[PDB]
């Protein structure tokens, strides 16, 4: 259908407690598949999905080599930003980056990303045209003139229209049995009293993939966009996911309420109820 | 695969 690949960078300075540290995690859709951490003993790019181990030794030399070079690169970025914002070198600061691509069923590049942040605020980001930049403030504008003269956009475009899609298509093929086979949520409804008049009814979605899901409670077919307590989708740990929606209700009315589950891995929207 | 974006801030 539609698939994404994303890389995520974190560089964090830590004055007088070592040189800045650089983490990288790689994602195909919601599956983590690669990792790198500069504080690791002999830092290298490590696999986090079975289907990536398939790549040969040339792959892992280049990947490790890139992440080592990025340790250096983001160490320079940290410094420059200090001077751009006139901030004492005694504090800690973070740079973050995400980039990657989206593909349709034909393999065609749907759209491309490359966004940079400084201390949790936008800094610079490549535009959807893959040709120009948006600089969040006057600091990031320095970077912009440099990157414009340097022609960084051209590199981003060359990557996103090329290697990005070529590799993503390859991982989807090699991991097809897991990446392109959606996992239906295993669902039930629980029952917990509050006093004599009030009970909570909770609607569980478990072991589903991808992360994207909707849960809604309905009193007599009316949406409780208000009175439903909804937790943010959480990871199980085994590469699938978890979610629950709940509502405060008076005793005996249990049957009036109904849980509705939407998920890619279900043939149809699922309705559910507390069992006597 | 990644690609190296060598150009700094």
């Amino acid at each position, epitope marked *: 259908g539609s698939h994404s690949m994303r890389y995520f960078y974190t560089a964090m300075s830590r004055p007088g407690r070592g040189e800045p540290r650089f983490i990288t995690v790689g994602y195909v859709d919601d599956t983590l598949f690669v990792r790198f951490d500069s504080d690791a003993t002999s830092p290298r790019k490590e696999p986090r999905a079975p289907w990536i181990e398939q790549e040969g030794p040339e792959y892992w030399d280049r990947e490790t080599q890139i992440s080592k*070079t990025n340790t250096q*690169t983001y160490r*320079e970025n940290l410094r420059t930003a200090l001077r751009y914002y006139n901030q004492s070198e005694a504090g800690s600061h973070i740079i973050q980056r995400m980039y990657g691509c989206d593909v349709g069923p034909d393999g065609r590049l749907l759209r491309g990303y490359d966004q940079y942040a400084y201390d949790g605020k936008d800094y610079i980001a490549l535009n959807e045209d893959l040709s120009s930049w948006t600089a969040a403030d006057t600091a990031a504008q320095i970077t912009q003139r440099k990157w414009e003269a340097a022609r960084v956009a051209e590199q981003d475009r060359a990557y996103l229209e090329g290697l990005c899609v070529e590799s993503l298509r390859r991982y989807l093929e090699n991991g097809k049995e897991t990446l392109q086979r959606a996992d239906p949520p295993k669902t039930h409804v629980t029952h917990h009293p509050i006093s004599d008049h009030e009970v909570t009814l909770r609607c569980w979605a478990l072991g589903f993939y991808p992360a994207e899901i909707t849960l809604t409670w309905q009193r007599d077919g009316e949406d409780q966009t208000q009175d439903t307590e909804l937790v943010e989708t959480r990871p199980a740990g085994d590469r699938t996911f978890q979610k629950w929606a709940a509502v405060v209700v008076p005793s005996g009315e249990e049957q009036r309420y109904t849980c509705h589950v939407q998920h890619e891995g279900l043939p149809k929207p699922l309705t559910l109820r507390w069992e006597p | 695969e990644e690609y*190296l974006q060598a150009f700094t801030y």
Partner: T-cell receptor
Amino acid sequence: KTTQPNSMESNEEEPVHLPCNHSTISGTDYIHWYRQLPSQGPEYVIHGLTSNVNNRMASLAIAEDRKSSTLILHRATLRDAAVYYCILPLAGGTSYGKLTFGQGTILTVHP
Amino acid sequence: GVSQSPRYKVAKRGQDVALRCDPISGHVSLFWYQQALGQGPEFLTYFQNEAQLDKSGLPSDRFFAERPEGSVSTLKIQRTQQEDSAVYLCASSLGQAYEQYFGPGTRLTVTE
């Protein structure tokens, strides 16, 4: 890693097409050109990636498959007589910009 | 732009020498190169501000560079041998992958 003619001659006030071959270039490797005039440090001329770049002294013409490129001096003068280096600083994503100058092309301009 | 002193240097084989480089003010990155007669320059060492991050090009441990204040750089060559005879070139740049402005080079000749 690049390969270029060891030397090249031309007339003054003539265009000069300095060629470079880079068979094994990354989809994301920049092409860079430097020159070094006699008894002076090297200087940057121009760089590019896929589309053709222009100065002001030089133009850079990258082939459609990017396996080779030409540096173009529009109107060569005596002062242009230098060694011309074609460098791939990023080296397939393994390096950060330190320059591996080649052997270069020695360009003599004749009056 | 970049300056380097001394421009020229004659050394007795065995004595120590220090080569100086003033980079363009505000440049984060500094590069030392060796240029041996007839060849292109050849990466010696790179600094990011004060940090010597890449000393992979240094022929031997005899070669010591520093950049205490992330400004001026000093390349020390101890117990100079004949083979050290070359032009040593200094370059600074706005950041690592940005255009390198070179100084005129220091010209070393080590004699017996």
